[model samples]
Each structure stands twice: as C-alpha cells, then as structure tokens.
Target: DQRFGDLVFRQLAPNVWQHTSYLDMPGFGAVASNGLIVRDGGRVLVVDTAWTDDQTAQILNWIKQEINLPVALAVVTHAHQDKMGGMDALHAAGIATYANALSNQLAPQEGMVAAQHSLTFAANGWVEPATAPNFGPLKVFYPGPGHTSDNITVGIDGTDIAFGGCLIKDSKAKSLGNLGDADTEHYAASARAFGAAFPKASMIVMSHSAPDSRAAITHTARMADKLR
Candidate 1:
C-alpha cells in the first residue's frame, strides 16, 4: 500500500500534535471538535476533554496506544461540564488533572450537578477528575471575569503556548459569553492579568479556535478593554 498509515499525523511545531476525534458535540463546531495534544518528552498534556466520559476515555485511550506514555497532566479551561466533566473517568484511569482554584471549589456543589443533569439524565457531567492526583499552578491574573467566575487560562512555559481558557476567542465574536456563573465586574481585570502574566508566548491557544498570534492577543486585549 502506498499509504503508510491510516491518517498521517502532521507536526504542528516541534512536539505538539493535532489529532481529530469523530465525537461531535452539539454546540461546538458543526462536527467533531479537534483536541490539541502537546507532548514534552515523556509528559503528555491534553488541552480540553470533550463532552461525555466515553469520548474522553477514547481520546485518552488513543494517546495511550500511540505513545505508550501516561498522561502527565490535564488543564480544563473552565468549570464547564464538557471541558472537564469527563475527568471523573480519566481520573479513575490515573491521569492527574487540574483547573483554577475557584472552579475546582464549585465542582462538588449541587448546582453544578443540576446543570450537568440538564444535558443527560445520567448527567455524567460535573464530576471533578479527582481520580487523577490533584496538582496545579493556580494563580490569579486579571482580564477578570467574562466567561465564568473560576476562569483561569493555562500556560505551557516550555513551548510558550498559552491556552486562553475560555475568555479569549479565535473568532469574530467580540465579548466572551455565559456570565451566569461569572463576575462580569472582575472579568476584564482578570483578562488583563492573564495577558500580563502570560507574556512572551508568541502563540496563544484559545481553547475554541486555531492557535492565534501575539498580534491577535493584542487585539483581544483591546477587545477586553472595550468590554470595560
């Protein structure tokens, strides 16, 4: 066969790789959304865990089979059910997971479970991936509170890749939404803090879009100011 493999894997940059899963989420892009997988030698980092425990397990399984390396850490952009609810499953499998302190605190609340129940009667949603040993580098920054209260972006110091959690976007949408669980008053300040703290990253990885450039980050900064 002329084809060497099923799907050819492209190198995004150095060790970072982009792979697609066929699991389609209702509100995300029309079809299955892609997850960014970054590897640092033996350590593997997953940006977001899509909806459902099954989907997350599948992706983690793929990583397991392909690289033979364990997932070193996971970063959930916010406390949203989709991004991390599956941590319940992944944690059982022994992958360490983390999110901002604020979000982490709210995971066990009844309200979180009720929201999760809205999606599926089973509500696989809202369980903290506590199975993975708890670990993090939680710190405060201000662009402040647009998406949700516990919003804290993730920074990958080694590759200079910063996952903008859920505040910054890669699309034309100007202001971040879903403030029901957010402190709008503080969102802007947090965004600024995020920008200042996570500086030196040429590439900004907003969880929802393609990786953006530093200029785009500057534009986002302006947008945040506009919201203020």
Candidate 2:
C-alpha cells in the first residue's frame, strides 16, 4: 500500500496488495522479487518475504505502522533464498511462518541457514501434490513443481489476485528462467495444471519481473513444453 526506496507496495484488489523489492541476483544482476500482503478483516497474511531481512522488516513496519493490520501468518512459497530468505527475521519478530515440508527439508540443505521456526505441511501421504491450507480469506497451495521442487501459489479466496511465486513467469519471459532446483521433467505438466486450476486469476504474480495475466501460467507451460 506504500512505496519506500527500492520497495514498492501496490494494491492489486480490494484486500490484496503486491509488495515488490529489488535485489542483487547472482545471474540476473539487480532483479525484483514480488510478495503479497492479503488483509482479511482485522488480520493480515504475508505470502512471501523479500530477498533480504531488512526489506522484509520494511514491509512489516509498513503493515504495522500504516495499515495497522497484524500479520497473523506468513508462508514461504519455496526454498529459494528470495522466497524464504526473511524467515529468520520474521521468526525473530515472533511472526509465525509456514512452509511445505519439502521446502523445510530442502531449504537448509541448499545452504539457506535462515530457514527455520516455520510450521510445515507434510505432503508424503497427501493425495495431491498441492495442499490447500486456509489462512482466513487467503488460500496457500503448492502447484506442483517448476521453478523449484517446492514452489507454491497463494491467493485470496474469491479474488483474482494469485501469487505464483517462482513457478510462474512474467509475460515477457521466453524461457523458464532458473531451473537449478526445478523438476524439468514434470515442470510443464505442473504449470499447465496450475493454469487450469486457477484460470480465472487476473493478476498472476511471479517472484521476479512484473505481474502478468493468466497467460503467464500458459506461457510457463508453453516454454516448459519447448524444453521437453
């Protein structure tokens, strides 16, 4: 709902806002990572954190100081640093964080030492690869694998805003971008399914680059198909 230096917060819908921050990415140089702030009644839900702890703190401050909404929950969409990097800072602030069990186990192994104190959802015996966990009006779900083995999407129930994390790409993307930890073999199917599941989402937010329409998911599927 506000902009501070490299951080920009814009309202995408009535109760959903997009928080974006620029960071020094290894391969892409300076890139922006998009997060979500969903406000439901008196409580708020943070879908993803920024690329660094300081950036995360800024967003939290704005939420508390300006909006005056208490962050009831935060979730890491994947194990990547940009997605779960601020988990420790959130933990230190006493804000509860959550992640898929796969992200909980893989993040630390990938050298993300700050991935801790977040509740995890076990997917071992789950019938679907994605699990739907309700957080007030917000729904967090893992849409199979693409950018990472544990990437997920978050959305406001009955709203068009959907945080696709790194699994979905910007409209201009011609390639899948980063696949270092992606399941390339199953990525296309995963993204295609996600697109079908949430075909009505108007604002499909990605971790890097600008927001896109529903076509972003289809674009991701198209690109992944080419890779196959």
Candidate 3:
C-alpha cells in the first residue's frame, strides 16, 4: 500500500500486491528483488520477505497499520537471501513461516534460516496442500530445479498472477546473474515445465526484475536452452 524505505509495495490486482526490495552487490549496483502479498478471504498470505529484518519488520508494520489483516502465513520461495532474508523478522513477529522441504534443509545449510514449517512436494507440480489450515491459495511447482535445486515458483491460485522466483528471467534481462547453484543440464526442461504450468499467468513475477508476462517464462527456457 505504501513505501517503507527499502521496501515498496504496489497493488497489481484486486487484493494482489507486489513488494520490491534492494540488495547492492559488488558489481551489480543496486539489484532489486520482488515478493508478493495476497489477501485471501479474511487473512493475507505473504510470499518472501525483504532482504533484511528491519525491512521485513517495516512490512509487518505496514500490514498491521494499513491492511489491518493478519498474515495467514508467509512463504519463502527458496533459501536465497533475497527470499528469506527477513525470516528472523517474521519469527520476531510470531508469524508462521512455510517453505519447500528442500528450501527448509538447504537454507540453514547455506547460512540462511529455515522456515518454521515445510511442504514436501510429491511431484513437480505440487499445489500447496489443503491439509495446512493456516495456508490459503498458493500453487507451488518444483519443475525439476534450475536456478537452484530448491527453487520453486508460486502462483496465487484462482488469479492470473504467478511468481516465477529466480528461475524465470525477465524478457529484457541481458544476463542470467548467478549460476553457482544452478542445474544447467536440467535448466531448459525445468524452465519449460514451469512455462507449461503457468499457461494462464499474465502477471508473471520474477525476482531481480519487474513483473513480466508469460513471455518471460519462454524467454528463460530459451536462455537455458542455449546453455546446453
């Protein structure tokens, strides 16, 4: 609804929001990252936190003051700092956090905090299970891992918005950014799988760039095709 220093929130659709945060790397200048917020029924579901606790706290404050709705749950797409950097802040606020089991395991191993809970994917296109009463509408797909083995894309089920995480590149992207944890051999297939799963996603959200269209998923798959 508003801007809080490093975190800026923008409404994309009715009850759907996007938040952008920044992390300056050595040569990358000021790289921006995006997350999501969705108001489902009476509670809000947050996707990814800011890259720092303070920024996350600010977001929490905004939700409390402006939206006046309790966050049903927060999901960390992966173990990356840009995704779960505000994990501690969420914990400080007593927010229940969830992530993929792989993300839960890899995050702590990679120096990031693990989410409070995890969803074990039974297959590539695993929708968030309904067993978790606290979780609302979110569709998470593994798609065989590209950017990282633990990376997953999230879609606001029943909406046209889908979060491609770091696996999908923006259509205008000139670089692939980091590849240290990438699965290059499977990247193309994975990207294609993600594209297949998001046929109705018009507002495709990608980390480190502006919100893109479905073409961005195709763009990423083609980029990965060049690698192998």
Considering every candidate listed, which one attains the maximal TM-score?
3
**Candidate 3 off by > 4 Å:** 127-133
Candidate 3 structure quality by residue, lDDT tens digits, 1-228: 467766788888888888888888787687788898888988888999888888888888878876888887898888989899899999988889988888888987787899988877766567447524456668777788799998888878788998888898888787667788999899889888887887788988888778888888888888898888
TM-score of each: 0.70, 0.88, 0.94
Model 1 spans with C-alpha error above 4 angstroms: 1-11, 18-36, 110-143
Candidate 1, residue 215: lDDT: 58
lDDT of 3: 0.83
The whole-model lDDT of each prediction reads: 0.55, 0.75, 0.83
Give the per-residue lDDT of model 1 (tens digit) for 88-145.
Answer: 7667677666555555666677123211111101121122334224223222232445
lDDT at position 24, candidate 3: 83
TM-score, predicted candidate 1 vs. hidden true structure: 0.70
By TM-score, is 2 or 3 better? 3
User: How many backbone clashes does every candidate have?
Assistant: 18, 0, 0
